[PDB]
Amino acid sequence: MWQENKSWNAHFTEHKSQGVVVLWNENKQQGFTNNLKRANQAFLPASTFKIPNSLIALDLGVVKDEHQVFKWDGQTRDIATWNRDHNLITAMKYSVVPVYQEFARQIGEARMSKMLHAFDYGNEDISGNVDSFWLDGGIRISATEQISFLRKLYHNKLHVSERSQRIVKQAMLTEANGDYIIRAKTGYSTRIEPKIGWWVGWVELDDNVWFFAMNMDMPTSDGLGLRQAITKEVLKQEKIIP
Amino acid sequence: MWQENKSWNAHFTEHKSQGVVVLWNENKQQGFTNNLKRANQAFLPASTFKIPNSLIALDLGVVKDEHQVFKWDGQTRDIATWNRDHNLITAMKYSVVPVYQEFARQIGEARMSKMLHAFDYGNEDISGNVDSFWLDGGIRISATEQISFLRKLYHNKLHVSERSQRIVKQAMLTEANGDYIIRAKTGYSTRIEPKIGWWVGWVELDDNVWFFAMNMDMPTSDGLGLRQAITKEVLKQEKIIP
Ligand SMILES: O=S(=O)(O)c1ccc(-c2ccc(S(=O)(=O)O)cc2)cc1
Ligand SMILES: O=S(=O)(O)c1ccc(-c2ccc(S(=O)(=O)O)cc2)cc1
Ligand SMILES: [Cl-]
C-alpha cells in the first residue's frame, strides 16, 4: 500500500533542502514517499487550509459563488497582490490571507469546529484565534492526512454540497496543458517552528489521477519556488509528467 | 457593440489562410472582429457541437459524470487516440466522434431538437441523422452565435442544471498557467464544403473574461494548428495574454 523511495532525497539535497513528497496512485491504490515518518508527521496547514476554508464558506453561504467580489479593506500590506479586490479564484491563487480571515470570522468557531470534525481534517482542532488558527493555533495535519482529505474532495465525498466541492476544485486549478492538469494549493507555515513550505493537490492524467502532498523546510521566502521545482522533479522521475 | 479591426487579417495572410476571429470583452460588453460579415456567417459547428451535446447528455443522465468510462467499440479508426476507452474529459479533448455519436443516439432526435431550441443554438435545425447532423446535417451557427451561447454557459444561464454546465466547463479546460485559463473546443468541418476549422471558448483573466470564436478555411488537415496559433497572435496583439 505504502512504499518508500529514498532516491527522491537527491532532489532535496541538490538544493540544500529537506522535506517529504507523498504520491498516491488512484487507479492502483498505492502510495509512495521518500520519508514514511515525515509523511505522517503533523504540521500547521498554513494556507493549504484555504481548501477546507473555501468549502465551508461556500456551503454555508458566506461566499455565494466564485464571482463574488471581496473588496480590499484599504490597508496596504506587504504582498502587493493582496492590495486589491478579489474573488474566490484570485484569493486562492494569491493566498490572500485577509480575505480568508474574514471568511473564518463569518463562519465562527462553532461551525468551523463541526465542519472540520465532519471533514475528518487533521486533528480537527481549532484552538487558538478564530481567524488565524491555521497559521498559529492548534490545528495540525500530516501529508498523508492531506491526501486522504484530497481524495474525498476529488470524489465529491465531503459533507458539503457537490456544488461547493466542484467550485473549490475549479479554484484549485494551477496549471494545465496537453499532458496534465494540476489542481493544488501552496502554503507557507512561518509563525510557529519549524518553518515549512507546503504543496498539496493532484495531477490529472488521461487515465489516472496522482494525488500529492509535500512539505519541506523553508527558513525564508526565497526558496518557495523549490516546492514546485522539486515536486515536478519527482513527478518526472516517476514518469507521471514528461 | 462590434468594432472591426482588420489589422488582424495580417495574421491570416502570413499563413496562406483566411478566416475570422471574434472577441467579446465581458467587463466592457464590447466586441471585436476582423470581418463582421464572416463573423455572422453560419457554418456547420462540427466538433464544437460537443459542448451542447455534452450539456444535454449530462442533464438527461446519458452521461453520469466526467469520470464514467465509455469503452472503445472495437473498430480501429484513422485517429489513433479514438481507439481506446474514454471519459467525458478525454472524449472532448481528442474530439472522439463515435463516443458522442452514441450520446446523440441515446438523446434521440426529439430531445435533441427541444434542447437546441431551449439553448437558442444557431438555426436550431437538426435535420439529417441524429448522430451526425453537426457534421453533415442542417445545423448552422455563426461565430457571434457561438459567443452568445458560450456567454450563457459561462454564466450558468442555459436551460440545464448548474451541475451540467459546471461539468462541461471543466471538460472544456484546454490550457492554464499563472497568466490565463483557456476553456475552448476545436472543430473541423470535413464532410460538407466549405471545409473550415473552428476554435471557440474564452480566456479567463484575474479581472475579466474574453470570449472568442474563430473559424478559418481548412482545405487540408495540415493547417489545423493554425487555429490556435492565429487566435493567440490576436490575443497577444490585443494585450489579452503576454
Ligand atoms: O504573517 S502574515 O499574515 O503577514 C503572512 C504573510 C504571508 C503568508 C503567505 C506566504 C506565502 C504563501 S504561499 O506561497 O505558500 O502560497 C501563502 C501565504 C502568510 C501569512
Ligand atoms: O468524417 S470522420 O467521421 O472520419 C471525422 C474525422 C475527423 C474528425 C475531426 C477532426 C479534427 C477535429 S479537431 O482537430 O477540430 O479537434 C475534430 C474532429 C471528424 C470526423
Ligand atoms: Cl477547471
UniProtKB/Swiss-Prot annotation, chains A, B:
Catalytic residues identified in the record: S47
Effect of S47A: Does not alter thermal stability
Post-translational modification: Carboxylated on the epsilon-amino group of a lysine, with the resulting carbamate functional group serving as a general base. Probably N-carboxylated at Lys-50 at neutral pH in vivo and undergoes complete N-decarboxylation, at pH 4.1, in vitro.
One GO CC term, this protein: plasma membrane
Gene induction: Expressed from an upstream promoter, P(out), in an insertion sequence IS1999.
Keyword Hydrolase belongs to the record: yes
An annotated GO BP: antibiotic catabolic process
Key words, A-Z: Antibiotic resistance, Hydrolase, Plasmid, Signal
UniProt xrefs under InterPro entries: Bact_Transpept/Beta-Lactamase, Beta-lactam/transpept-like, Beta-lactam_class-D_AS, PCN-bd_Tpept
Documented EC number(s): 3.5.2.6
Reactions listed under catalytic activity: a beta-lactam + H2O = a substituted beta-amino acid
Keyword Phosphoprotein: no
PANTHER family assigned: BETA-LACTAMASE YBXI-RELATED (PTHR30627:SF6), PEPTIDOGLYCAN D,D-TRANSPEPTIDASE (PTHR30627)
Function summary: Class D beta-lactamase which confers resistance to the beta-lactam antibiotics, including amoxicillin, and moderate resistance to cephalosporins and carbapenems such as cephalothin and imipenem; in the DH10B strain of E.coli. Acts via hydrolysis of the beta-lactam ring. Has oxacillin-, cephalothin- and imipenem-hydrolyzing activities.
Family listed: Belongs to the class-D beta-lactamase family.
Subunit-level organization: Monomer. Dimer.
Record protein name field: Beta-lactamase OXA-48
Annotated gene: OXA-48
